[PDB]
């Protein structure tokens, strides 16, 4: 037979991959960072509070201008916010109320959303009629849509629960590339700053680094226990951080092929719903099901603050491109700006 | 001017507030079944790529049937966005004795979920007339064990089928389980669901008011 040989071949490939990592695992990030100054107690205050959503807020994204913001809710509406003056710029009603993700175009002319309807809808924001209308529906996924991130004005990457990720052409409306290789449903996604690679977390305790141009998986990272529901990319673009249901966060590197630091404590037993980084990469913010949001010293793993003030589980979390504010949504139908 | 943009924001709030009244009286029902259960014909008698929500109204009360198709087999915590529903409607084929064992497992996995706690259950034993014809000529002892009743009595078999469903709950003492032996009657199906969700809310008010 040959399946037994292939199983044997797969058995010995993993040994050589571990040995290659183990040989290069000469030290740890903690040992090198045993002589740097601690950041101290971070204190943040709720500057603004955005009211108007009628149900649980599932997704939220920041505009590149660092002033506008979009949010989604179980009610089935999309609201564009002016974070400075708490002004509702737009209010987009959706066809389906089961929407689990939303994205903002880098140029600002489009927004995207999707969910348990297995499709992604693109909305034109700058029309001559003075309204907001859907531009194109992107069908081709067999599971529910779990994440989407605009590449360009004519390109978007979507991940679904059918264990795959895809790259689309909005003008044509057809799936250009399909990324296969996962085992469980993909829950997260994170575009690189250069926008040429991306990473995805799935419900199999595995994160894979992909290549949009080539359509093939470059790297694979393991070490978690439960499903990974939050992934973010380091500002340098050479690392990323995960967050899983086992109440732990880890920092992986694309070059060392290894986990570097672990962000867990004995007083936390609930999972992580969202993960975000700071403009300089020195802080790591993560939402939790314990109704709070935690700030971690990314270079020291020491907790350094708590963003408390929400009355339910924190779902969303984002940092502006200029590093001046943090927005967090939660199941109590409120958004809060923290400075 | 920035003062004319503030009036646009306040005009949006007036439209949002007009929907707050509707969502405060909305009742969501999650519908489950199978291909032979009769979910297609059941919805045909209701005068209304993923989930097919059917918004309608009974006795000036808004209703919404979240009818997932075959997607209900998904078994992740993310898929449990239905933690805000008030009841779960389950369609079961009584005539199909062979698949009753199969239909008895998916019931066990859903109702015992840690998310669907504080949610009531409604059971609709569909095609009862076919069961009447199927029994009195075909025994159920050849398909099921631990059946001490008479296999040629409709009331004896019916009293056994419901007990098989009721014994697969490890969280019984939190919420009730209603059962109906419905058919293609086409008329009472909307009224039977109305009473079950009326008493579900009533038994939520009685604890919230400290009246019981």
């Amino acid at each position, epitope marked *: 037979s040959e399946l037994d040989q292939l199983r044997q071949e797969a058995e010995q490939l993993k040994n050589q991959i571990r040995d290659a990592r183990k040989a290069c695992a000469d030290a740890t990030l903690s040992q090198i960072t045993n002589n740097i100054d601690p950041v101290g107690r971070i204190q943040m205050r709720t500057r603004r509070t955005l009211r108007g959503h009628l149900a649980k807020i599932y997704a939220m994204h920041w505009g590149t201008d660092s002033r*506008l913001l979009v949010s989604a809710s179980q009610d089935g509406k999309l609201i564009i916010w002016d974070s400075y003056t708490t002004n509702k*710029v737009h209010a987009i009603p959706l066809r389906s109320s089961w929407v689990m993700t939303c994205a903002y175009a880098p140029s600002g002319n489009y927004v995207a959303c999707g969910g348990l309807d297995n499709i992604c809808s693109i909305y034109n924001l700058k029309t001559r009629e*003075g*309204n907001v209308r859907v531009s194109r529906e992107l069908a081709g996924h067999t599971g529910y849509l779990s994440c989407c991130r605009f590449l360009d004005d004519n390109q978007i990457v979507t991940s679904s629960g059918d264990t795959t990720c895809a790259l689309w052409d909005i003008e044509t409306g057809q799936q250009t590339t399909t990324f296969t290789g996962h085992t469980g449903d993909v829950m997260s996604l994170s575009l690189a700053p250069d926008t040429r690679l991306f990473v995805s977390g799935a419900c199999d305790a595995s994160a894979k680094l992909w290549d949009v141009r080539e359509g093939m998986c470059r790297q694979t990272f393991t070490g978690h226990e439960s499903d990974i529901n939050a992934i973010c990319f380091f500002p340098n673009g050479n690392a990323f951080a995960t967050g899983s249901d086992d109440a732990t966060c880890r920092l992986f590197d694309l070059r060392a092929d290894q986990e570097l630091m672990t962000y867990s404590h004995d007083n936390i037993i609930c999972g992580i719903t969202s993960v975000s980084f700071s403009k300089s990469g020195r802080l790591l913010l993560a939402g939790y099901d314990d109704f709070n949001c935690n700030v971690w010293d990314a270079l020291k793993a020491d907790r350094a603050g708590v963003l408390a003030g929400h009355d339910n589980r924190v779902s969303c979390l984002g940092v502006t491109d200029d590093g001046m504010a943090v927005a967090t949504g939660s199941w109590d139908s409120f958004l809060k700006i923290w400075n | *001017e920035d003062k*004319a*943009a503030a*009036e*646009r924001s306040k*005009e949006i709030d007036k439209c949002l507030s007009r929907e707050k009244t509707y969502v405060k009286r909305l009742v969501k029902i999650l519908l489950l079944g199978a291909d032979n259960s009769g979910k297609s014909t059941f919805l045909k008698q209701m005068r209304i790529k993923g989930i097919h929500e059917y918004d309608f109204e009974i006795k000036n009360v808004p209703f919404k049937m979240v009818d997932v198709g075959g997607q209900r087999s998904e078994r992740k915590r993310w898929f449990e966005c239905f933690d805000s529903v008030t009841s779960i409607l389950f369609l079961v084929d009584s005539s199909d004795f062979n698949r009753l064992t199969e239909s008895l497992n998916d019931f066990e996995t859903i109702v015992n979920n840690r998310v669907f706690s504080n949610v009531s259950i409604i059971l609709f034993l569909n095609k009862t007339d076919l069961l009447e014809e199927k029994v009195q000529i075909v025994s159920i002892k050849d398909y099921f064990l631990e059946f001490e009743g008479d296999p040629h009595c409709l009331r004896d078999v019916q009293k056994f089928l419901v007990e098989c469903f009721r014994n697969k709950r490890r969280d019984q003492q939190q919420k009730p389980l209603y059962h109906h032996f419905t058919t293609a009657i086409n008329t009472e199906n909307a009224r039977l669901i109305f009473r079950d969700v009326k008493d579900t809310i009533l038994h939520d008010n009685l604890k919230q008011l400290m009246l019981q």
Partner: single-chain antibody, 232 residues
Framework: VQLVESGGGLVQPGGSRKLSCSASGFAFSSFGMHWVRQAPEKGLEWVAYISSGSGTIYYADTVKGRFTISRDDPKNTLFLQMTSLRSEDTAMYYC??????????????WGQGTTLTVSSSDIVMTQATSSVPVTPGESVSISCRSSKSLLHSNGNTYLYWFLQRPGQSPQLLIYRMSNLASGVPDRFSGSGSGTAFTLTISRLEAEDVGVYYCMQHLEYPLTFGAGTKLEL
């Protein structure tokens, strides 16, 4: 996409005339509309305003009391009512749509205009450029100034530029003194700091002839500068 106004005609002093404007091709319920008049040989003059939902209404100091502006959103129409028509009301009336949110471009689309003949403080916005002769293919600059500083605390400078081609309705070129309207070639640019403003054309063409106006939106008694004719 269409803004057709009608209802004008010859009238006697002291008589009443009603102006109606019909919109078709856009979400009329979310646009605040304006009335702008133009004397038979002089520049434009703002008249009235009605918000979206008819929340706030503003009038010119010369027509307050005699003029009333109302809208009928379901019928997609806008109305102007005049009761005591004097001899200074002989002009051409335009209708302008405008929407206000963060990043919008108001005054983008103007109507077609209806004529009316009668047989019988605030920022002063200046333009000492009555006539200028040009040659196609060259670069020109149009200068302007205001009594007060148009720069606001929120960083927005409210100065607009308009172009009226011979026998054509005015069109928007630059809004908020730095932003280029959609559908306008890149050769048009604007500058200025808080009091003196200039519109620059890189390469001239045959369609650049006409009269260039400008406007302020800082205080609602809106004022237009005098015309600037490109003689060519």
């Amino acid at each position: 996409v269409q803004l057709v106004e009608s209802g004008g005609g010859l009238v006697q002093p002291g008589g009443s005339r009603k102006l109606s404007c019909s919109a078709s091709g856009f979400a009329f319920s979310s646009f605040g509309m304006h009335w702008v008049r133009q004397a038979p040989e002089k520049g434009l003059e703002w008249v009235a305003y009605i918000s979206s939902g008819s929340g706030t209404i503003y009038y010119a100091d010369t027509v307050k009391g005699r003029f009333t502006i109302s809208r009928d959103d379901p019928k997609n129409t806008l109305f102007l009512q005049m009761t005591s028509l004097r001899s200074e009301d002989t002009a051409m009336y335009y209708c302008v749509r405008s929407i206000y949110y963060y990043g919008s471009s108001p005054f983008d689309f103007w109507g077609q205009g209806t004529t009316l003949t009668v047989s019988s403080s605030d920022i002063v916005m200046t333009q000492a450029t009555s006539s200028v002769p040009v040659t196609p293919g060259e670069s020109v600059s149009i200068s302007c100034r205001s009594s007060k500083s148009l720069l606001h605390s929120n960083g927005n400078t409210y100065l607009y530029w308009f172009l009226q081609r011979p026998g054509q309705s005015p069109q928007l070129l630059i809004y908020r003194m730095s932003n280029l309207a959609s559908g306008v070639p890149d050769r048009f640019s604007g500058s200025g700091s808080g009091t003196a403003f200039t519109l620059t054309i890189s390469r001239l063409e045959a369609e650049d002839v006409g009269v260039y106006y400008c406007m302020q939106h800082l205080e609602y008694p809106l004022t237009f500068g005098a015309g600037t004719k490109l003689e060519l």
